[PDB]
Amino acid sequence: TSIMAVTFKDGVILGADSRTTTGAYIANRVTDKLTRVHDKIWCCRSGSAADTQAIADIVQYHLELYTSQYGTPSTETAASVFKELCYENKDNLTAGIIVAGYDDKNKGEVYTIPLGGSVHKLPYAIAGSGSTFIYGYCDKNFRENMSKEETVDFIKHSLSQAIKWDGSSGGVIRMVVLTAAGVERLIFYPDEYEQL
Amino acid sequence: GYDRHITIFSPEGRLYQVEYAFKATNQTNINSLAVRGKDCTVVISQKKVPDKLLDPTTVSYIFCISRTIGMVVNGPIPDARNAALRAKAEAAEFRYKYGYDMPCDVLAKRMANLSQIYTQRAYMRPLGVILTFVSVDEELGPSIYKTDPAGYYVGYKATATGPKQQEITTNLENHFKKSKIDHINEESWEKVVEFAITHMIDALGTEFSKNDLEVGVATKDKFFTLSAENIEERLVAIAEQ
Amino acid sequence: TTIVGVKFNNGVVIAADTRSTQGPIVADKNCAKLHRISPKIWCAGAGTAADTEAVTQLIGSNIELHSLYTSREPRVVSALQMLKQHLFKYQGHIGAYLIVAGVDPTGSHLFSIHANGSTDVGYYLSLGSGSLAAMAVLESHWKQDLTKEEAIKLASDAIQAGIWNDLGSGSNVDVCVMEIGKDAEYLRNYLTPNVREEKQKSYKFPRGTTAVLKESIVNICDIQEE
Amino acid sequence: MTDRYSFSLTTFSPSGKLGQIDYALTAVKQGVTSLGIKATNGVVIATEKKSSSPLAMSETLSKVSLLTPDIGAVYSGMGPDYRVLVDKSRKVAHTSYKRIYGEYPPTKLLVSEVAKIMQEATQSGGVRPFGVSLLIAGHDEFNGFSLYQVDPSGSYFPWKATAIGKGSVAAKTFLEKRWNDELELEDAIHIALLTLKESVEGEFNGDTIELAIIGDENPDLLGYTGIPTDKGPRFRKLTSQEINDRLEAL
Amino acid sequence: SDPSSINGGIVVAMTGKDCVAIACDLRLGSQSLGVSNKFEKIFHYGHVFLGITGLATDVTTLNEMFRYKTNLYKLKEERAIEPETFTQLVSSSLYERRFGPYFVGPVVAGINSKSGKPFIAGFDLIGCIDEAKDFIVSGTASDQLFGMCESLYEPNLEPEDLFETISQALLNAADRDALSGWGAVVYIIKKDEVVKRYLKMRQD
Amino acid sequence: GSRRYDSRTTIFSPEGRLYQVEYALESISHAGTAIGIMASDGIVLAAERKVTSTLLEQDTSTEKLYKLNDKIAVAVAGLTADAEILINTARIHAQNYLKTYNEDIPVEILVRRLSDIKQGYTQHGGLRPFGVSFIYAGYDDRYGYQLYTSNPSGNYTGWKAISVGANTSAAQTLLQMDYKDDMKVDDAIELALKTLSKTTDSSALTYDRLEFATIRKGANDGEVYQKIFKPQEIKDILVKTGIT
Amino acid sequence: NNYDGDTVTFSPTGRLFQVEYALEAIKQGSVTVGLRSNTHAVLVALKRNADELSSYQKKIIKCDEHMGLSLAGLAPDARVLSNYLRQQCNYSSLVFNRKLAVERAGHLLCDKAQKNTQSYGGRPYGVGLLIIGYDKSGAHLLEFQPSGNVTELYGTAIGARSQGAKTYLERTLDTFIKIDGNPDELIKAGVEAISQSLRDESLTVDNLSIAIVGKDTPFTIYDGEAVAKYI
Amino acid sequence: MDIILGIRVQDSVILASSKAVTRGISVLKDSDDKTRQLSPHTLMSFAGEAGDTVQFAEYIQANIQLYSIREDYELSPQAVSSFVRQELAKSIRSRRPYQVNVLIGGYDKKKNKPELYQIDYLGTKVELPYGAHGYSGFYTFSLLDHHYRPDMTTEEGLDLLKLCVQELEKRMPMDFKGVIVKIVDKDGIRQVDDF
Amino acid sequence: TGYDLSNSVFSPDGRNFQVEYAVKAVENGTTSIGIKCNDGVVFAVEKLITSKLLVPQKNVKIQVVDRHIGCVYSGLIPDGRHLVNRGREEAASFKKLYKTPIPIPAFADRLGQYVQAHTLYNSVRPFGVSTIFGGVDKNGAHLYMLEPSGSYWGYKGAATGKGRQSAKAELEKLVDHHPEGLSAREAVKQAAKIIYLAHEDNKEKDFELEISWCSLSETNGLHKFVKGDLLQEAIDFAQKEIN
Ligand SMILES: [Cl-]
Ligand SMILES: [Cl-]
Ligand SMILES: [Mg+2]
Ligand SMILES: [Mg+2]
Ligand SMILES: [Mg+2]
Ligand SMILES: [Mg+2]
Ligand SMILES: [Mg+2]
């Protein structure tokens, strides 16, 4: 799995590959790893598919009940709910989740929740098995307040390299853009990103 | 005469505590009305702010239960909010368990079943409220379902609740006797709200300012309440013809 | 076991082989692996056979009660949500690997679900020991906008690949077609390409071949009157 | 909090009467008339859809309910009590039978389970009895067609034909004169409609009358084909049009 | 150590023309030691017959459990349980112990009293139903029984021909299994008569 | 709080009587009469259904006589729904005993168990007692044919002939007059029907108002048979004994 | 009247009669006085005997090295409440290495007593308490009522005829608050205060009970010949 | 413990049980009676894990004595053996199972027949003409298979039992310190004090 | 009759008399008020000096919940403390799960549902307090008042206790004369005056004034007690207005 979320001038973009493996067998080559827990709060999932789906479904339930009572939740609040589930059940979970969201007050925000259940607010985050191969590239190429087109290129190039070297990553590159304008889904096929 | 204090049968086969809970329903002296359009369901309710020290924005008997379901309550606010919190919890749990949004009629039945339990179990009292649930259901379309302290519920073409419900009901009955259809044949919800307000004015014989009303509107995939300025625009259109 | 699911124009088709095994021994040669959750929601199971049956019937029971409670025809997403939450709770110990397909007022659906409770969406899916043989066929011949006839053909071909190439699969092909606005048609033994040839010899014994010590009538009737 | 009513609310009076059960039966007496008639090849259950308001959509209020594919129920008395009993009856048909034997319960045993639930509300702590009488019609392979009445006490009796609620006394006399052991299902429906007309004041048509039958298997209502042994439900609710057709031959 | 092969034993069931047959060996052992030659593994509740192989304590326990349940069934239903219904009851009862199972291999045999149709069924220790048209096998010599039945069996055998087939299937299977034998019983079941026959076989 | 509404179902009167038990017995005195008569070669159970209708489906109806197992049956007087709760519990106890000891439950052990359950509701729990009196007819290989009765107090006693329900005073006097120890089942059948015919509050005793059962060793050889009489069989025995 | 059957029932004027009846038990109890300066806090208690053969019922209970109380009313209820205080003082020391503030001790007693006034089945406590202590903010005196009301005071008295002692302390307020660094004079003021509540009987050697806590003084109780000095 | 044997003859059941109690290195006792009288005509011998054997046996004894008092009636040997089997079958799926194997020798006064039941710690019950637990059967069953007759007298049963014990004393590595022998018949239970 | 002997029983009117009797206990209590200002809220309460022996400034009545909410109440003081303890648990669990401090409307409903729950059963007694509370959250200032029935609304100004009628009239003047709004420092002064004016209903004994406030500019949105010079300035302003 190669996943990442990157804040930029107009908000935040989440990115992911589409490969799900059982050992060396690709059980699903068109997986959607970008998950909606609220209208403009999404997450990228890595680790146990069963665990991250179970967690995400519970978070979506919590934020739906939050919204009915207290109105739209912040991205920080969503990250906190994720963290509560991951930290308190750390012994029984294998989940690495990146939470990304857009407020109008706070704009684009990214939180990463690694295996232990700690929370880290970052300008951008990378995770999954494929992320190891792009720490150098992403650190060298990330800038704050990029444009939408620049951020799409940064994620496309980053995940391209992660896919190239990591056998557990592959398929299509999916992206979800979170801004004031709304929610936009993007997809990029092998013939596009392999020639980069 | 302790058959009047708890929910057990009187010699006539009556439940007096249920009957008295129906009487508590009119304690707020507020009338509500609900009607269905082609694409929408509209609910209006009288808004009375008798104290100048009150923040009028917090005085409400309309609730946003889920994204799709709205609920207006006739009765005291403590029992209203009790029912509101439960309905919100039930709607959220339903979505989590069964993977789709709780329908308006199903929520009404669920809250009606809970109410039924209070009429049979002695330690629980009935809630002194009548709950009108509204939505545009993905299967049934525009929907009005109303629940009472007896645990009764039923779907409505249109409905009215409050001290002067009979006047509003007869007014609505007479209109649907003319039109011979089960809804307001109108494209926009704005005009369905205008219909609702007009027929409440006719039935009650009173005029309304923007602060005298409270309006909820259900459309496909969302329920929302109108602001005082949205209602003002509605009142202006009514007066201009 | 080989099970597949294939989406088409106006619905979805699922298929399965009919061999069940303990180890290297074939327990049943004509096993029914297509299970009904509700009239128009069917699923096929691989893994522990009792678990696939039990989890189907439990969710199928609760789906029926839910349908009566809500006065609505059951949805595939409801079956999926109830199945996954049940399976996740038991942390993979209930060894049910299912392909869940069906039609409802929302449309036609195809999902897979693993024993740990992870789920998948797709236009074509395969599960079981013969899933790699089946997926090879699906990946070679699947296209968008398949007709009903093309989807049945593709599904049964994918099962055949499992039958012939996977030792865990064999015998017959079962198919169930779920089309929007129609009754689901269950096609038991849709293909029968493995009928045993006539034996060289009859092994019917002469009467009195077996040595007998005692004979007696067994009273299966209740205590009698008079 | 906690339910601190752990004592019986129904108790024996000096005369030996169980007051709360008697009063529950009084509530049933006030209820709208419902009836059941058993024929040789089916059972019919019927009642009036007493609409509380003309603005109400009475099709959304089901007085006649499917319990299993071959068992249906109707009531007289308190509607909400009936609705929750239907929910419990549907569930108990699964939990205490179908999940054990892989088949739906026979009519008499489902009736027995419903009766047990109603008996317990008559003895358990901090509850009142259910204010309904039920008429349950059904079919099963080994018992054939049957019709049962269940009262607030939990007592149940099998009937050839009967009525409960408002005008039951007059209706039962009407049924006694008309019933024989050679009736076909259509004859029973005809008698049901005749009997029900006497207790109905206002409109009498397919929109104000609710009627269902337990009869032949309906393969068209099964939802799937391919299993020869599965032939469809025997319970079928008659449409508004189907009722009106038989009201011309009345 | 393996609970399903401590005591040993086998059951086999077959269908014929308007009849069914169910048969079992009589051995109970403690691994290598032969303990009893009178341990019958076939029971009946009304007209429904149940064979049970595996761990002997569970064989006895389940017989008592199904006697218990079919007796209550009869009192409430006012009729004897049928093979199809009983098969579901066995499955339900086994699966309720999903994570602490009875170590058994049950086999149901009987004729439906209303339809007259012959019925047989097999189960794994956890309740999965094998409803074969031809034959069901169970026990420590199930491989041997599969080999015998697959070659010896032919459909629509008359009761007295079916007896010879099932007897020879059991006997020769048991003689290739160390933990089966020490006597054998065969039930021939018709709609309203059942005959029970004890077979003569080698006692080693 | 809740104390206000508590009837206190398990208290003594100043005279040392249990109010609810006494009032439950009053209830039972209005139920249809049930009679049990024990003979040397079997037991007879006869009972009157309460004012019936012509539309009642009698052949599938059961309100008085119930089977507990193959050897033991009961006649009921009181609330039928209450009785069925206890009857199911008794059926389970019998099967629990059979599973434990691999022998049919002795009649008295079953009777004591049900009677102890009734007793519990009079001493603890604050619930109303079961408004039911049973006549137990049964056979075991220790005491042979046995008749017992139990009432809402949980007290039980053994009998040669006994009645419960309505007009027990008149019924018991009639039984005491004509009962003899060397009596046979066919004689007991006649006594039971004659007693009901005289004590009934109905105008005449007919087949549709009766439930009838016999427990006989009239089962072929060393075993016992229960016979719940069919409506036609009750009609025949009424003609045979010369009541209709 | 119709509203005094239990603690869960308000009267039509908004009164809780069971709580008021519990308050009445304190008025029947023997007099006890509390007063403090800026360095020390003192409890003085008139102990009551059953007869001439009997002992004099103890009135003062130590809760910690820095805190303790005197009681008036049902003595077993004081034992329950003082035990609870002992535990809370102890919890504070063990978990936080911190001596429990006297004001916080009052808050805990209030909340414990309150739960018995709003629930069915229970009853209010039938005892009044005077809590003295020396913590990080100096000397303190609290008065506890079983209604839940806890009040911080310079001086007070509860029990029968306590009004006489309370008026005296109200007069002497400006004098006894200034008795700093002189334990004996502060006790004298307390013994003189409790004397304004005596009738027919006087303070004897087994009648009088005195407690003191202060800056460099652990909570200690004086009985017997230890109080003869003050008689 | 170690060797327990049982033989049902014409009119009685004979139970033989070893006397040794060994705790690892040392033989602590050589006169231990590994049996309990459950009722006047029912005897149970036992062997298995230390502590559990006596605890189980006395628990069963207490239950059968309780039944006898409540009903004023002695349960048949079959009924007692069924009760014991259920307790062990219940026990085997407990948190800590009873590791106890038993023989139940009883004389049925109703049928006028001796009866011997063998039940292991799993709840495996069999009615036998002769039985054993542990390795005892490996040495003795070939002798019993040869000489046993269903019409044997009590004296002949004791003589066949002596031959079995002699073969055990010859070929078994462990010194079990002889056996206590008890006879169960119509007159009750008695111990053979010279064997 | 007998409908007023048990909580949660509906009278033939549809009234819960036990709740109405709880109101009588509230009306018997001392005067407490709340004033919503431009960027916060001000709370004030009358503390009756029963005796000279009461230590001044020690028996604090106003209570903080979390760090941004103030609570004051009239009636049975212990009941108010019980309600605040519950409020503190509600606020803690909200922050634990959602990270952000509990919004004031959210907190209002938590108290509301809890008080309403004590009108559902006869095994509990209704709360004998009306509670005025509020503070600053992400959407600004909020002031609430909660009754024994569980009923609560948002307020511009709020008053309860024995001198509530007097106080309400004073609050209504401020609302009319300041449609643009009142500053936090002005609200503290006005709160002092209103308590002094409302003390006429309790004129027998003298009293002690206690004021607190949460303001975005003056206290950084945190609840703080008005102490020392600022308190004395408010007391002087109040004493000047009554003369
Ligand atoms: Cl990381
Ligand atoms: Cl519900
Ligand atoms: Mg790759
Ligand atoms: Mg109630
Ligand atoms: Mg896991
Ligand atoms: Mg062999
Ligand atoms: Mg051998």
Contact D57 B9 (CB under 8 A): no
Strand (E) or helix (H) holding I106: helix I104-117
Residue matched to tokens 């963290």: A83
Rounded distance, CA B45 to CA B197, Å? 9
Q: Enumerate the residues of chain B whose CB falls inside 8 A of the CB of residue D30.
A: 13
Rounded distance, CA B210 to CA F71, Å? 82
- Contact with chain D for residue I124, Cβ under 8 A: yes
Strand (E) or helix (H) holding C88: helix C76-89
Rounded distance, CA C135 to CA A27, Å? 10
Structural domains counted in chain A: 1
SS3 content of chain G, % helix, strand, coil (to 5): 35, 30, 35
Picking from E98, E113, E157, E187 by the largest number of C CB atoms within 10 A of its own CB, the best residue to mutate is E98
- Contact with chain E for residue F98, Cβ under 8 A: yes
- Contact with chain H for residue E35, Cβ under 8 A: yes
Q: What is the assigned CATH class of domain H1-195?
A: alpha beta
Please give the single-letter amino acid code of residue C225. Answer: E
Residue B139 is part of a domain; what is its CATH number?
3.60.20.10
Compute the residue count for chain F. 244
Rounded distance, CA G197 to CA G48, Å? 14
For residues E133 and E148, is the Cβ–Cβ distance under 8 A? no
- Closest to F83 (Cα-Cα) out of F8, F139, F136: F136
I30 as an active site residue: the answer is yes
- Contact with chain C for residue E140, Cβ under 8 A: no
Name which of D99, D100, D106 is nearest E77 (Cβ-Cβ).
D106
Q: Enumerate the residues of chain I whose CB falls inside 8 A of the CB of residue G3.
A: 5
Find the radius of gyration of the CA atoms of chain E.
16
Task: Name the residue range of residue F55's domain.
Answer: 1-244
Rounded distance, CA G211 to CA G141, Å? 12
Please give the single-letter amino acid code of residue F149. Answer: T
Q: What is the assigned CATH class of domain E1-204?
A: alpha beta
Residue H81 has phi, psi (to 5 degrees) of -65, -35
Residues 6+ apart with CB under 8 A from E15: E21, E118, E119, E120, E133, E134, E135, E155
The two three-digit tokens of residue G134, written as one number: 């020396």
Q: Enumerate the residues of chain D whose CB falls inside 8 A of the CB of residue C65.
A: 90-91, 94
Q: Enumerate the residues of chain E whose CB falls inside 8 A of the CB of residue H120.
A: 30
Residue matched to tokens 């013969």: C130
Task: Name the residue range of residue D241's domain.
Answer: 1-250
Q: Where are the beta strands (DSSP E) in I37-110?
A: 40-48, 63-65, 69-75
Rounded distance, CA E184 to CA E182, Å? 7
Three-state SS at C70: helix
Resolution number, Å: 2.9
Contact I124 D4 (CB under 8 A): no
- Contact with chain D for residue I123, Cβ under 8 A: yes
Please give the single-letter amino acid code of residue H45. Answer: S
Q: Enumerate the residues of chain C whose CB falls inside 8 A of the CB of residue A48.
A: 116, 118
Residues 6+ apart with CB under 8 A from H70: none
The CA-CA-CA angle for residues I124, I126, I128, to 5°, reads: 135
- Pairing mode of beta strands D34-39, D161-164: antiparallel
Cα(D144) to centroid of ligand 5, in Å?
51
For residues A70 and I103, is the Cβ–Cβ distance under 8 A? yes
Residue matched to tokens 């309370």: G166
- Closest to F242 (Cα-Cα) out of F188, F183, F212, F197: F197
For residues I70 and I64, is the Cβ–Cβ distance under 8 A? yes
Cα(A167) to centroid of ligand 5, in Å?
23
The CA-CA-CA angle for residues B140, B141, B147, to 5°, reads: 70
Q: Enumerate the residues of chain F whose CB falls inside 8 A of the CB of residue G120.
A: 1-2
DSSP classification of residue G203: -
Cα(A113) to centroid of ligand 1, in Å?
8
Contact E55 H118 (CB under 8 A): no
F104: distance to nearest CA of chain C, Å? Answer: 15
Rounded distance, CA D117 to CA D154, Å? 8
Please give the single-letter amino acid code of residue D131. Answer: G
Three-state SS at D10: coil
Q: Cα F53 to the chain's mean position, in Å?
A: 23
The CA-CA-CA angle for residues F172, D17, F24, to 5°, reads: 50
Residues from B in contact with C at Cβ < 8 Å: 96-100, 103, 105-106, 109, 139
Structural domains counted in chain G: 1
- Closest to G31 (Cα-Cα) out of G221, G199, G179, G149: G199
Cα(A19) to centroid of ligand 3, in Å?
8
Q: Could you write out the three-class secondary structure of chain A? A: CCEEEEEECCEEEEEECCCEEECCEEEECCCCCEEEEECCEEEEEEECHHHHHHHHHHHHHHHHHHHHHHCCCCHHHHHHHHHHHHHHCHHHCCEEEEEEEECCCCCEEEEEECCCCCCEEECEEEECHHHHHHHHHHHHHCCCCCCHHHHHHHHHHHHHHHHHHCCCCCCCEEEEEEECCEEEEEEECHHHHCCC
The two three-digit tokens of residue B159, written as one number: 């409905």
Rounded distance, CA C83 to CA C117, Å? 8
Residues 6+ apart with CB under 8 A from C64: C38, C74, D94
Identify the chains in contact with I, defined as 3+ C-beta pairs within 8 A: A, B, D, F, G
Method: X-ray
For residues I40 and I191, is the Cβ–Cβ distance under 8 A? no
Rounded distance, CA D11 to CA D18, Å? 6
Please give the single-letter amino acid code of residue D139. Answer: H
For residues D133 and D152, is the Cβ–Cβ distance under 8 A? yes
The two three-digit tokens of residue G79, written as one number: 């034992």
Structural domains counted in chain F: 1
Task: Name the residue range of residue I170's domain.
Answer: 1-243
Rounded distance, CA I134 to CA I34, Å? 9
Kindly list the protein residues that place their beta carbon closer than 5 angstroms to ligand 3, a single-atom ion: A 163, 170
- Closest to E174 (Cα-Cα) out of E18, E23, E20: E23
Task: Name the residue range of residue G4's domain.
Answer: 1-231
- Pairing mode of beta strands C184-191, D224-225: parallel
Q: Which residues pair with I35 in a beta bridge?
A: I42, I157
Q: Does B have 3 or more CB contacts under 8 Å with I? A: yes
Contact F9 D10 (CB under 8 A): no
For residues G194-227, one letter each, b for 16 or more C-beta atoms within 10 angstroms of the residue's C-beta and e for the rest, the string is: bbbbeeeeeeeeebbbbbbbbeeeebebbbeeeb
Residue D245 is part of a domain; what is its CATH number?
3.60.20.10
Name which of A62, A69, A74 is nearest I106 (Cβ-Cβ).
A69
Structural domains counted in chain D: 1
Cα(C116) to centroid of ligand 5, in Å?
7
Rounded distance, CA G189 to CA B222, Å? 76
Q: Could you write out the three-class secondary structure of C150-218? A: HHHHHHHHHHHHHHHHCCCCCCCEEEEEEECCCCEEEEEEEECCCCCCCCCCCCCCCCCCCCEEEEEEC
Contact C25 E146 (CB under 8 A): yes
Q: Does G have 3 or more CB contacts under 8 Å with I? A: yes
Structural domains counted in chain I: 1
C153: distance to nearest CA of chain B, Å? Answer: 32
- Closest to E178 (Cα-Cα) out of E46, E24, E5: E5
- Closest to I7 (Cα-Cα) out of B21, F7, F1: F1
Rounded distance, CA F41 to CA H170, Å? 62
Determine how many CB atoms are found less than 10 A away from the CB of residue F242. Answer: 9
Catalytic residue among I1, I30, I119, I160: I30
Residue B78 has phi, psi (to 5 degrees) of -60, -50
Find the radius of gyration of the CA atoms of chain A.
16
- Closest to G129 (Cα-Cα) out of G116, G147, G117: G147
Residues 6+ apart with CB under 8 A from G41: G34, G35, G132, G133, G134, G139, G140, G141, G212, G213, G214
Rounded distance, CA G204 to CA G46, Å? 10
Rounded distance, CA D168 to CA D156, Å? 17
Helix A49-70 with A75-88: angle, nearest 10 deg = 130
Three-state SS at E61: helix
- Closest to I219 (Cα-Cα) out of I148, I140, I136: I136
Number of the ligand closest to the Cα of E178:
6
Contact C40 D222 (CB under 8 A): no
Residue E32 has phi, psi (to 5 degrees) of -70, -30
Rounded distance, CA F220 to CA D116, Å? 38
- Closest to F61 (Cα-Cα) out of B163, G115, D146, C98: D146
For residues I100 and I70, is the Cβ–Cβ distance under 8 A? no
Strand (E) or helix (H) holding I192: helix I184-198
- Closest to D115 (Cα-Cα) out of D99, D98, D95, D92: D92
Rounded distance, CA D77 to CA C64, Å? 27
Rounded distance, CA I141 to CA I146, Å? 17
Rounded distance, CA E175 to CA E154, Å? 22
Helix D240-248 with D185-199: angle, nearest 10 deg = 90
Q: Cα A133 to the chain's mean position, in Å?
A: 17
Strand (E) or helix (H) holding G152: strand G150-152
Rounded distance, CA E201 to CA E199, Å? 6
